[PDB]
Amino acid sequence: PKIKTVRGAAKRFKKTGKGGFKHKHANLRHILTKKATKRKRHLRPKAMVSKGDLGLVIACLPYA
Amino acid sequence: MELVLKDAQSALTVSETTFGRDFNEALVHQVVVAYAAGARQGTRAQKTRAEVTGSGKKPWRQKGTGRARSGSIKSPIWRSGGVTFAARPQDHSQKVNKKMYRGALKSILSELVRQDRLIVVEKFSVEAPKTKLLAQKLKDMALEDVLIITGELDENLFLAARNLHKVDVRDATGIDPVSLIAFDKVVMTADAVKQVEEMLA
């Protein structure tokens, strides 16, 4: 066989220039009027997947 | 570089990159092991537990006999039972890169020149298709174990070397690493030398 991508991980991480993975932050979909604008403004840019989790991500995304 | 002809006493001008480079023993070893691996007809199969001619009936009840628990009479622990990791027919070919194959031929040709196992004759043909004539001809040239390689495959030479054990006649196209290394002396026609340089660039 040929390795299948964990497909719902491809919709959530995207590869960068030096091999790290970017992802959208959690907590910014609903319940929102209770949150400060400082939270929400700091959750909008995309973020790098941390060191702990790259193992998991590279396992799920073997072609990206 | 020049190759001294045996009979005409000329010198054939060759490439130093083809007939005068170093012996890369690791490269040659990879191409030799790969050539020999390509020859394996990998035909075999043992029967796994699934293919052994039996039944899937469980031989005794799971509990209460004092026997060890068993589930199939085709278990690999049982006599008559089915190989655990039974083999299948497999392909043993290795990829050799083209530049590694050509590199290996350049190394072995350079060492056949360097060890005086490479003889360059101008013409090498037999009169009639007789093994007696080729036996006498190789006897006159002090050669017993020999790989004759000719740029144009003569029919009579091919029929004359077909019974001689140590002797093998090839065209310049179909040479392999294991025969240049296998045979004691290689006798190339000058035309075969030119065709070899055209092959190996």
């Binding site: 964990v6 919709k11 998991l56 | -």
Partner: protein
């Protein structure tokens, strides 16, 4: 000399054989510890499985879409276009030089190093820096 050829030093590493004896290092448990799901034949959990905690690829939101059009755009360096056989650059003349691909419809002439010959670029987008680099080394860009 087929019994004198020998591989390189370091190329053929041995291969772990598990389950043979005490001296070998990997006998009884073969290097897989005591009981558990991981010491079992077939045993192991699936990819991105954190016990039952919601996995990383499933507690983070999904973003974006795939373009359809970025799969037919290309990106030409300046190291090529000395490779086009002609000194004239269109989408064909690049396709013919095995440099973009047949499905490609859009191309762009990014500064990525060292154009020398005078090249006439036709119908391709060119970046700013590479417009200066094509026009500086003779060159011509029309569209």
């Amino acid at each position: 000399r087929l019994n004198t050829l020998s591989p390189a030093e370091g190329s053929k590493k041995a291969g772990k054989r598990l389950g043979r004896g005490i001296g070998s290092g990997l006998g009884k448990t073969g290097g897989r510890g005591h009981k558990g799901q991981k010491s079992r034949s077939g045993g192991g959990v699936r990819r991105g499985f954190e016990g039952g905690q919601m996995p990383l690829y499933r507690r983070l939101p999904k973003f974006g879409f795939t373009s359809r059009k970025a799969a037919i755009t290309a990106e030409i360096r300046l190291s090529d276009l000395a490779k086009v056989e002609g000194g004239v650059v269109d989408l064909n003349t690049l396709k013919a030089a095995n440099i973009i691909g047949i499905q490609i419809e859009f191309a762009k002439v990014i500064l990525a190093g060292e154009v020398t010959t005078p090249v006439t670029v036709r119908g391709l987008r060119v970046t700013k820096g590479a417009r200066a680099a094509i026009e500086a080394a003779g060159g011509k860009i029309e569209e």
